[PDB]
Motif scaffolding. Structure first.
Motif, PDB file in Angstrom:
ATOM      1  N   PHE A 100       0.839  -1.189   0.000  1.00 54.66           N
ATOM      2  CA  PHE A 100       0.000   0.000   0.000  1.00 54.66           C
ATOM      3  C   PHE A 100       0.877   1.244   0.000  1.00 54.66           C
ATOM      4  O   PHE A 100       1.549   1.541   0.986  1.00 54.66           O
ATOM      5  CB  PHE A 100      -0.932   0.007   1.216  1.00 54.66           C
ATOM      6  CG  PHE A 100      -1.650   1.303   1.483  1.00 54.66           C
ATOM      7  CD1 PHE A 100      -0.961   2.414   1.944  1.00 54.66           C
ATOM      8  CD2 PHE A 100      -3.016   1.407   1.275  1.00 54.66           C
ATOM      9  CE1 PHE A 100      -1.620   3.602   2.190  1.00 54.66           C
ATOM     10  CE2 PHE A 100      -3.679   2.593   1.520  1.00 54.66           C
ATOM     11  CZ  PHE A 100      -2.980   3.690   1.978  1.00 54.66           C
ATOM     12  N   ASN A 101       0.884   1.954  -1.117  1.00 55.81           N
ATOM     13  CA  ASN A 101       1.697   3.148  -1.254  1.00 55.81           C
ATOM     14  C   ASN A 101       0.931   4.402  -0.865  1.00 55.81           C
ATOM     15  O   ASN A 101      -0.206   4.608  -1.291  1.00 55.81           O
ATOM     16  CB  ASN A 101       2.191   3.273  -2.688  1.00 55.81           C
ATOM     17  CG  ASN A 101       1.058   3.344  -3.688  1.00 55.81           C
ATOM     18  OD1 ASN A 101       0.069   2.622  -3.575  1.00 55.81           O
ATOM     19  ND2 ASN A 101       1.198   4.220  -4.677  1.00 55.81           N
ATOM     20  N   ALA A 102       1.570   5.246  -0.064  1.00 52.98           N
ATOM     21  CA  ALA A 102       0.960   6.491   0.371  1.00 52.98           C
ATOM     22  C   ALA A 102       0.751   7.421  -0.818  1.00 52.98           C
ATOM     23  O   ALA A 102       0.041   8.421  -0.719  1.00 52.98           O
ATOM     24  CB  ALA A 102       1.819   7.162   1.431  1.00 52.98           C
ATOM     25  N   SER A 103       1.369   7.076  -1.948  1.00 54.52           N
ATOM     26  CA  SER A 103       1.239   7.873  -3.160  1.00 54.52           C
ATOM     27  C   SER A 103      -0.222   8.239  -3.381  1.00 54.52           C
ATOM     28  O   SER A 103      -0.642   9.362  -3.102  1.00 54.52           O
ATOM     29  CB  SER A 103       1.779   7.104  -4.370  1.00 54.52           C
ATOM     30  OG  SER A 103       1.834   7.932  -5.519  1.00 54.52           O
ATOM     31  N   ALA A 104      -0.997   7.275  -3.863  1.00 58.34           N
ATOM     32  CA  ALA A 104      -2.417   7.483  -4.096  1.00 58.34           C
ATOM     33  C   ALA A 104      -3.214   7.121  -2.848  1.00 58.34           C
ATOM     34  O   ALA A 104      -3.015   6.058  -2.260  1.00 58.34           O
ATOM     35  CB  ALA A 104      -2.889   6.666  -5.286  1.00 58.34           C
ATOM     36  N   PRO A 105      -4.125   8.004  -2.422  1.00 64.29           N
ATOM     37  CA  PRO A 105      -4.951   7.777  -1.232  1.00 64.29           C
ATOM     38  C   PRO A 105      -5.947   6.634  -1.424  1.00 64.29           C
ATOM     39  O   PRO A 105      -5.939   5.956  -2.458  1.00 64.29           O
ATOM     40  CB  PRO A 105      -5.689   9.109  -1.056  1.00 64.29           C
ATOM     41  CG  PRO A 105      -5.706   9.717  -2.414  1.00 64.29           C
ATOM     42  CD  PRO A 105      -4.418   9.298  -3.065  1.00 64.29           C
ATOM     43  N   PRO A 106      -6.821   6.405  -0.426  1.00 64.48           N
ATOM     44  CA  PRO A 106      -7.832   5.347  -0.491  1.00 64.48           C
ATOM     45  C   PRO A 106      -8.747   5.536  -1.690  1.00 64.48           C
ATOM     46  O   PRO A 106      -9.882   5.993  -1.558  1.00 64.48           O
ATOM     47  CB  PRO A 106      -8.611   5.511   0.815  1.00 64.48           C
ATOM     48  CG  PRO A 106      -7.698   6.256   1.723  1.00 64.48           C
ATOM     49  CD  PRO A 106      -6.892   7.164   0.835  1.00 64.48           C
ATOM     50  N   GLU A 107      -8.237   5.186  -2.863  1.00 64.70           N
ATOM     51  CA  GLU A 107      -8.992   5.318  -4.100  1.00 64.70           C
ATOM     52  C   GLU A 107      -8.372   4.463  -5.197  1.00 64.70           C
ATOM     53  O   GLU A 107      -7.160   4.257  -5.230  1.00 64.70           O
ATOM     54  CB  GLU A 107      -9.042   6.782  -4.544  1.00 64.70           C
ATOM     55  CG  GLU A 107      -7.753   7.548  -4.296  1.00 64.70           C
ATOM     56  CD  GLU A 107      -7.374   8.449  -5.456  1.00 64.70           C
ATOM     57  OE1 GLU A 107      -8.229   9.248  -5.891  1.00 64.70           O
ATOM     58  OE2 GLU A 107      -6.222   8.353  -5.929  1.00 64.70           O
ATOM     59  N   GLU A 108      -9.216   3.960  -6.084  1.00 62.77           N
ATOM     60  CA  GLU A 108      -8.762   3.115  -7.179  1.00 62.77           C
ATOM     61  C   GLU A 108      -8.061   3.932  -8.256  1.00 62.77           C
ATOM     62  O   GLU A 108      -8.640   4.857  -8.826  1.00 62.77           O
ATOM     63  CB  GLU A 108      -9.948   2.360  -7.769  1.00 62.77           C
ATOM     64  CG  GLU A 108     -10.965   1.883  -6.747  1.00 62.77           C
ATOM     65  CD  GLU A 108     -12.376   1.810  -7.300  1.00 62.77           C
ATOM     66  OE1 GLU A 108     -12.930   2.872  -7.653  1.00 62.77           O
ATOM     67  OE2 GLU A 108     -12.926   0.692  -7.379  1.00 62.77           O
ATOM     68  N   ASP A 109      -6.807   3.583  -8.526  1.00 59.12           N
ATOM     69  CA  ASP A 109      -6.017   4.280  -9.531  1.00 59.12           C
ATOM     70  C   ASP A 109      -5.102   3.313 -10.275  1.00 59.12           C
ATOM     71  O   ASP A 109      -4.305   2.596  -9.665  1.00 59.12           O
ATOM     72  CB  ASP A 109      -5.183   5.385  -8.877  1.00 59.12           C
ATOM     73  CG  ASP A 109      -5.493   6.769  -9.412  1.00 59.12           C
ATOM     74  OD1 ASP A 109      -5.781   6.887 -10.622  1.00 59.12           O
ATOM     75  OD2 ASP A 109      -5.447   7.735  -8.622  1.00 59.12           O
ATOM     76  N   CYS A 110      -5.220   3.301 -11.597  1.00 58.52           N
ATOM     77  CA  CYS A 110      -4.401   2.429 -12.430  1.00 58.52           C
ATOM     78  C   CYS A 110      -3.413   3.251 -13.248  1.00 58.52           C
ATOM     79  O   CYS A 110      -2.778   2.740 -14.172  1.00 58.52           O
ATOM     80  CB  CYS A 110      -5.284   1.595 -13.358  1.00 58.52           C
ATOM     81  SG  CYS A 110      -5.657  -0.073 -12.728  1.00 58.52           S
ATOM     82  N   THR A 111      -3.288   4.528 -12.899  1.00 59.75           N
ATOM     83  CA  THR A 111      -2.378   5.428 -13.595  1.00 59.75           C
ATOM     84  C   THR A 111      -1.038   4.753 -13.858  1.00 59.75           C
ATOM     85  O   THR A 111      -0.511   4.046 -13.001  1.00 59.75           O
ATOM     86  CB  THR A 111      -2.141   6.721 -12.794  1.00 59.75           C
ATOM     87  OG1 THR A 111      -3.349   7.120 -12.136  1.00 59.75           O
ATOM     88  CG2 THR A 111      -1.659   7.841 -13.704  1.00 59.75           C
ATOM     89  N   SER A 112      -0.496   4.974 -15.050  1.00 58.29           N
ATOM     90  CA  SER A 112       0.781   4.384 -15.429  1.00 58.29           C
ATOM     91  C   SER A 112       1.867   4.733 -14.416  1.00 58.29           C
ATOM     92  O   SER A 112       2.562   5.738 -14.564  1.00 58.29           O
ATOM     93  CB  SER A 112       1.194   4.865 -16.822  1.00 58.29           C
ATOM     94  OG  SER A 112       0.709   6.173 -17.071  1.00 58.29           O
ATOM     95  N   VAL A 113       2.009   3.895 -13.393  1.00 59.82           N
ATOM     96  CA  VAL A 113       3.017   4.116 -12.362  1.00 59.82           C
ATOM     97  C   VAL A 113       4.348   4.520 -12.989  1.00 59.82           C
ATOM     98  O   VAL A 113       4.623   5.707 -13.164  1.00 59.82           O
ATOM     99  CB  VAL A 113       3.222   2.860 -11.486  1.00 59.82           C
ATOM    100  CG1 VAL A 113       4.452   3.008 -10.606  1.00 59.82           C
ATOM    101  CG2 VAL A 113       1.993   2.584 -10.631  1.00 59.82           C
ATOM    102  N   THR A 114       5.164   3.527 -13.328  1.00 58.63           N
ATOM    103  CA  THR A 114       6.467   3.779 -13.942  1.00 58.63           C
ATOM    104  C   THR A 114       7.237   4.845 -13.177  1.00 58.63           C
ATOM    105  O   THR A 114       8.278   5.323 -13.627  1.00 58.63           O
ATOM    106  CB  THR A 114       6.319   4.245 -15.402  1.00 58.63           C
ATOM    107  OG1 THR A 114       7.445   3.810 -16.174  1.00 58.63           O
ATOM    108  CG2 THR A 114       6.206   5.762 -15.467  1.00 58.63           C
ATOM    109  N   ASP A 115       6.703   5.228 -12.030  1.00 61.59           N
ATOM    110  CA  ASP A 115       7.320   6.258 -11.210  1.00 61.59           C
ATOM    111  C   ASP A 115       8.342   5.673 -10.244  1.00 61.59           C
ATOM    112  O   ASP A 115       9.548   5.748 -10.482  1.00 61.59           O
ATOM    113  CB  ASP A 115       6.243   7.021 -10.435  1.00 61.59           C
ATOM    114  CG  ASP A 115       6.312   8.519 -10.659  1.00 61.59           C
ATOM    115  OD1 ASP A 115       6.956   8.945 -11.641  1.00 61.59           O
ATOM    116  OD2 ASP A 115       5.723   9.268  -9.851  1.00 61.59           O
ATOM    117  N   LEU A 116       7.854   5.108  -9.148  1.00 59.97           N
ATOM    118  CA  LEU A 116       8.726   4.530  -8.132  1.00 59.97           C
ATOM    119  C   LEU A 116       9.773   5.551  -7.681  1.00 59.97           C
ATOM    120  O   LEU A 116      10.933   5.204  -7.459  1.00 59.97           O
ATOM    121  CB  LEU A 116       9.425   3.279  -8.671  1.00 59.97           C
ATOM    122  CG  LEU A 116       8.555   2.367  -9.541  1.00 59.97           C
ATOM    123  CD1 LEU A 116       9.130   0.961  -9.590  1.00 59.97           C
ATOM    124  CD2 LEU A 116       7.133   2.328  -9.017  1.00 59.97           C
TER     125      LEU A 116
END
Length: 159
Positions: A100-116
């Protein structure tokens, strides 16, 4: 260097990570990525939340500290029969991992991560494969596995 990633998606702020292991992934590589995108070990809280929000991989993903399978619903069909924290029970090998990443909050997101962005610079080909919905490529460092590309001294014991 290069590395093949594999994640399901970040639902409710939870994204399941993998390392070109699919059932053959270890905590070393996995955990490395799960952290890559500012996240914490697959806790029971982060999992249940993302589970009640409609999230699952239908696969064996590493939990707080054991291979488990999501099943917030009593409709056994994904794993086998048992629901919730479905631990594996077959041949020995490996599996996937959640975080569970603090990045995106309690919400569904499939955004192209590729971030890390929680990693470090490096020519490491960080390509995050989205289960089967997408696949993004990146260049950084987190696995620190250069031997997987251009080996130095080949091993040879058994004659």
């Amino acid at each position: 260097a290069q590395i093949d990633l594999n994640i399901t998606c970040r639902f409710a702020g939870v994204f399941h990570v993998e390392k070109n292991g699919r059932y053959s992934i270890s905590r070393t590589e996995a955990a490395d990525l799960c952290k890559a995108f500012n996240s914490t070990l697959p806790t029971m809280a982060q999992m249940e939340k993302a589970l009640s929000i409609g999230f699952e991989t239908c696969r064996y993903g590493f939990i707080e500290g054991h291979v488990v399978i999501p099943r917030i619903h009593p409709n056994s069909i994904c794993a086998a029969n048992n629901t919730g924290v479905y631990i594996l029970t077959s041949n020995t090998s490996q599996y996937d991992t959640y975080c569970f990443n603090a990045s995106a909050p309690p919400e569904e997101d499939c955004t192209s991560v590729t971030d890390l962005p929680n990693a470090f610079d490096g020519p490491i080909t960080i390509t995050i494969v989205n289960r089967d919905g997408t696949r993004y490529v990146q260049k950084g460092e987190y696995r620190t596995n250069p031997e997987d590309i251009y080996p130095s001294n080949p091993t040879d014991d058994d004659v």
